[PDB]
């Protein structure tokens with residue numbers, strides 16, 4: 052597998068029609084997963100499944116600018132399970148990131164960071180065994 056935390060370079064940033072696919076397996080008794088699409092030190096799109104926030108499972112999405120987190124967008128639809136293999140697909144579309152998990156649409160996150168071609172790294176972290184991380188233009 053891959054070593055977690057894992058950094059995937061995104062050469063020349065992202066662009067609509069770029070599809071990023073993450074394959075892995077959630078560890079037993081997982082607490083968190085995170086994808087961090089970064090523009091330098093900023094996080095354009097943080098995607099953060101939390102397995103136990105006040106005994107609830109929730110996905111928290113946000114943006115970090117100049118070391119400040121913005122307004123959280125929360126999704127209670129939670130397709131992950133401790134112990135199970137998953138596929139996360141993040142498709143960049145003109146106005147938003149579109150996320151599907153295990154081939155089912157999960158959420159969209161509107162672009163707050165506008166310079167898409169400067170979002171040049173994806174950090175993958177958390178309680179997973181990471182199998183692959185890649186991208187393709189569709």
Ligand SMILES: OC[C@H]1O[C@@H](O[C@H]2[C@H](O)[C@@H](O)[C@H](O)O[C@@H]2CO)[C@H](O)[C@@H](O)[C@H]1O
Pocket residue numbers: 097099111112113120121123
């Ligand atoms: O916003 C994403 C960001 O959240 C931090 O945790 C927040 C928490 O969600 C919020 O409810 C509380 O009031 O403040 C915390 C600190 O900002 C995470 O620590 C961070 O890793 C991101 O996930």
